[PDB]
Design an enzyme around this catalytic site. Structure first.
Site, PDB file in Angstrom:
ATOM      1  N   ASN A 179     -35.363  -9.182   3.039  1.00  0.00           N
ATOM      2  CA  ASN A 179     -35.473  -8.108   2.057  1.00  0.00           C
ATOM      3  C   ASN A 179     -34.239  -7.257   2.323  1.00  0.00           C
ATOM      4  OD1 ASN A 179     -37.867  -5.375   1.403  1.00  0.00           O
ATOM      5  ND2 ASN A 179     -36.103  -6.171   0.257  1.00  0.00           N
ATOM      6  N   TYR A 191     -26.155   0.419  -8.090  1.00  0.00           N
ATOM      7  CA  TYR A 191     -27.316   0.924  -7.387  1.00  0.00           C
ATOM      8  C   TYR A 191     -27.000   2.236  -6.694  1.00  0.00           C
ATOM      9  CZ  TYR A 191     -30.689   0.882  -3.468  1.00  0.00           C
ATOM     10  OH  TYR A 191     -31.634   1.220  -2.525  1.00  0.00           O
ATOM     11  N   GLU A 196     -34.206   6.542  -7.009  1.00  0.00           N
ATOM     12  CA  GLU A 196     -33.463   5.328  -6.689  1.00  0.00           C
ATOM     13  C   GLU A 196     -33.202   4.726  -8.067  1.00  0.00           C
ATOM     14  OE1 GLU A 196     -35.671   2.012  -4.963  1.00  0.00           O
ATOM     15  OE2 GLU A 196     -33.948   1.509  -3.710  1.00  0.00           O
ATOM     16  N   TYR A 249     -31.003   1.854 -10.800  1.00  0.00           N
ATOM     17  CA  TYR A 249     -30.340   0.567 -10.958  1.00  0.00           C
ATOM     18  C   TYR A 249     -29.830   0.323 -12.370  1.00  0.00           C
ATOM     19  CZ  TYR A 249     -32.929  -1.384  -6.822  1.00  0.00           C
ATOM     20  OH  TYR A 249     -33.462  -1.726  -5.602  1.00  0.00           O
ATOM     21  N   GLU A 294     -28.807  -7.596  -4.239  1.00  0.00           N
ATOM     22  CA  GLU A 294     -30.093  -7.412  -3.576  1.00  0.00           C
ATOM     23  C   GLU A 294     -30.878  -8.709  -3.594  1.00  0.00           C
ATOM     24  OE1 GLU A 294     -32.274  -4.006  -4.845  1.00  0.00           O
ATOM     25  OE2 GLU A 294     -34.194  -4.694  -4.040  1.00  0.00           O
TER      26      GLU A 294
HETATM   27  C1  LIG Z   1     -36.976  -3.866  -2.856  1.00  0.00           C
HETATM   28  O1  LIG Z   1     -36.039  -2.956  -2.296  1.00  0.00           O
HETATM   29  C2  LIG Z   1     -35.768  -3.238  -0.929  1.00  0.00           C
HETATM   30  O2  LIG Z   1     -34.396  -3.031  -0.606  1.00  0.00           O
HETATM   31  C3  LIG Z   1     -33.937  -1.672  -0.782  1.00  0.00           C
HETATM   32  C4  LIG Z   1     -34.734  -0.707   0.107  1.00  0.00           C
HETATM   33  S1  LIG Z   1     -34.253   1.015  -0.305  1.00  0.00           S
HETATM   34  C5  LIG Z   1     -33.351   1.562   1.171  1.00  0.00           C
HETATM   35  O3  LIG Z   1     -34.122   2.580   1.822  1.00  0.00           O
HETATM   36  C6  LIG Z   1     -33.567   2.956   3.101  1.00  0.00           C
HETATM   37  C7  LIG Z   1     -32.168   3.560   2.913  1.00  0.00           C
HETATM   38  S2  LIG Z   1     -31.402   3.888   4.539  1.00  0.00           S
HETATM   39  C8  LIG Z   1     -32.456   5.155   5.306  1.00  0.00           C
HETATM   40  O4  LIG Z   1     -31.893   6.452   5.059  1.00  0.00           O
HETATM   41  C9  LIG Z   1     -32.737   7.519   5.549  1.00  0.00           C
HETATM   42  C10 LIG Z   1     -32.914   7.406   7.069  1.00  0.00           C
HETATM   43  S3  LIG Z   1     -34.026   8.720   7.666  1.00  0.00           S
HETATM   44  C11 LIG Z   1     -33.477   6.026   7.421  1.00  0.00           C
HETATM   45  O5  LIG Z   1     -33.513   5.872   8.834  1.00  0.00           O
HETATM   46  C12 LIG Z   1     -32.606   4.930   6.811  1.00  0.00           C
HETATM   47  O6  LIG Z   1     -33.190   3.661   7.051  1.00  0.00           O
HETATM   48  C13 LIG Z   1     -31.274   2.580   2.139  1.00  0.00           C
HETATM   49  O7  LIG Z   1     -30.053   3.220   1.810  1.00  0.00           O
HETATM   50  C14 LIG Z   1     -31.945   2.085   0.860  1.00  0.00           C
HETATM   51  O8  LIG Z   1     -31.160   1.044   0.290  1.00  0.00           O
HETATM   52  C15 LIG Z   1     -36.242  -0.900  -0.116  1.00  0.00           C
HETATM   53  O9  LIG Z   1     -36.960  -0.157   0.859  1.00  0.00           O
HETATM   54  C16 LIG Z   1     -36.649  -2.375  -0.024  1.00  0.00           C
HETATM   55  O10 LIG Z   1     -38.009  -2.517  -0.410  1.00  0.00           O
END
Ligand SMILES: CO[C@H]1OC[C@@H](S[C@@H]2OC[C@@H](S[C@@H]3OC[C@@H](S)[C@H](O)[C@H]3O)[C@H](O)[C@H]2O)[C@H](O)[C@H]1O
Length: 191
Positions: A45, A78, A87, A89, A178
């Site tokens: 993922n 994105y 979020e 797209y 992705e």
């Molecule tokens: C279906 O989508 C799948 O892939 C994309 C991610 S979204 C993802 O969320 C996390 C952040 S990084 C994050 O920032 C805040 C600090 S507190 C934390 O420690 C970090 O991990 C990414 O930029 C973003 O792309 C979906 O979760 C997943 O299901």
């Protein structure tokens, strides 16, 4: 410059963000200029790409891509905003899964030679740039898939805002690839 885990920073003038749940097989490689290449398979993922941070309301993105997905994968602009946390797209191409399946349609927008249907979905207590949170996801899905061209972000943002989908302060904005339990390869060049 091969990444070994989720990571962010800037490379050759371009911001990069790579997020992975660490599963499956994946090699995300930072390359010359605004380019990156990624090869993946297995039960992972992830989402990653190059672009800017912060994103802007009027950025006009030009990209090219050799995109070869197998399964649920997207090629899309994105990004995120804060206050409200969103979020978003602009889906240029995708694999076996249309991300708007079962999503609430909010109209459509015609821009850069293509037509995109607009949708809103919600993620409940899921990973985000602010930690575990509940937030909305905005989508612009092209009716015809393509892997290269110009994306005039102002047309997408304004279509969303006019449809009642508020946007907050810009966080990152990238041209990402992705995948979820998919496989494939992709070389994307932003700019
Ligand atoms: C279906 O989508 C799948 O892939 C994309 C991610 S979204 C993802 O969320 C996390 C952040 S990084 C994050 O920032 C805040 C600090 S507190 C934390 O420690 C970090 O991990 C990414 O930029 C973003 O792309 C979906 O979760 C997943 O299901």
């Amino acid at each position: 410059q091969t990444l070994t885990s989720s990571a962010t920073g800037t490379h050759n003038g371009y911001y990069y963000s790579f997020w992975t749940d660490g599963q499956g097989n994946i090699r995300f490689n930072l390359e010359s200029g605004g380019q990156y290449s990624v090869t993946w398979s297995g039960n992972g993922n992830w989402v990653g790409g190059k672009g800017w941070n912060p994103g802007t309301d009027n950025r006009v993105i030009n990209y090219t891509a050799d995109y070869r997905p197998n399964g649920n994968s997207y090629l899309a602009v994105y990004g995120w905003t804060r206050n409200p946390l969103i979020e978003y797209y602009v889906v240029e191409s995708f694999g076996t899964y249309d991300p708007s399946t079962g999503a609430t349609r909010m109209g459509s927008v015609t821009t850069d030679g293509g037509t995109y249907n607009i949708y809103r979905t919600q993620r409940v207590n899921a990973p985000s740039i602010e930690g575990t949170k509940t937030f909305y996801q905005y989508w612009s899905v092209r009716t015809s898939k393509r892997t290269g061209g110009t994306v005039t972000m102002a047309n997408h943002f304004n279509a969303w805002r006019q449809a009642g989908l508020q946007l907050g302060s810009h966080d990152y904005q990238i041209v990402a690839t992705e995948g979820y339990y998919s496989s494939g390869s992709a070389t994307v060049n932003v700019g």
